[PDB]
Each structure stands twice: as C-alpha cells, then as structure tokens.
Amino acid sequence: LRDNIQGITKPAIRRLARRGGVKRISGLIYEETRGVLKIFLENVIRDAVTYTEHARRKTVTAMDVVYALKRQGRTLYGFG
C-alpha cells in the first residue's frame, strides 16, 4: 500500500468542488486537497485506532469512528 493518495482522482475532487458550489478550479487545488484530506484522515483514524485499542479489540467498528468524529465536534448521525 504505497502512493494510494493518488487514488483520489481529479474528477472526484472536481465533483466534490462542484457539490460545494465552485465554478472554476485551479491546477494545484488537487494536491492541496489531497494533503488536507490526508491530514484529516490521519487525525480521525488515529483517534479511532486508539479507541479500538483500548477495548482490547483489533477490528475497527463504526462506533469507534463515530466516537472519534464526535471528539472533534463533527457528530455524525446514521451510524449509531
């Protein structure tokens, strides 16, 4: 598993921007978005892995992710 951050293709970023209301997009927006997404994922996955490590488990469940998101003030409904 190496260089999989490139799996977030340009059309995916463009579609995400269009959903957000962006009309035109620059060139380095893709790299900037990939870096930002990597940082966010690193934080959330670290918290989820800590939560699942505490319970002496090894499979990360949806509840761990929900708790990790809630700890950042990003509460998510629909996965309770």
Partner: protein, 96 residues
C-alpha cells in the same frame, strides 16, 4: 459540431451535484487509502465495512464544507477560480 461556452456545463454540474446525495469518491481507492493510513499506527488492523463507509461520508462532508469556505474566500478577492491560497486562508481562519 456543437460546443458549449466555458462555464455553462460547470453551472449545470453545480446544479446537478447539489441535488443528489450519493458519494462522489470511488469506494475502493478510499478503502485502500484508509488502510494504508491506518497501517502507520497499528499493523494487522481489520476494518469493518461500516467504519470505512462512515469515514468516507465524513471526509466528503468535510471537503464540501472546506470548498464552500474556499469559494467564499475566492469571491472575496474578486475572482471566480479557487486557488491554494484560498484553501490555506480558510483553514487558517477556521483554526486548522
């Protein structure tokens, strides 16, 4: 043949993608990315599918909000094209 002027198809795509509610990132690449990212913390980790789905939904919502803020910053500068400095400014103001 027939060609649209620039920005018309972009406006149509903005209208179309804000109506629907499905996911926009392909599922398998995101699953691979999440697995690689988690491999840095604890090896031999297994992910329940619902956890990956929740992560994808949260990431997409966060990116959409960030792009809304970026568009606001770009409009503030008398521009219509978002730029990396807009993302940096929005993240800095948000406290990230």
């Amino acid at each position: 043949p027939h060609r649209y002027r620039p920005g018309t198809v972009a406006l149509r795509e903005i209208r179309k993608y804000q109506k629907s509610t499905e996911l926009l990132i392909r599922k398998l690449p995101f699953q691979r990315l999440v697995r690689e990212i988690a491999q840095d913390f604890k090896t031999d980790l297994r992910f329940q599918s619902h956890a990956v789905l929740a992560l994808q939904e949260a990431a997409e919502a966060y990116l959409v909000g960030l792009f809304e803020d970026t568009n606001l910053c770009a409009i503030h500068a008398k521009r219509v094209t978002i730029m990396p400095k807009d993302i940096q400014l929005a993240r800095r103001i948000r406290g990230e």
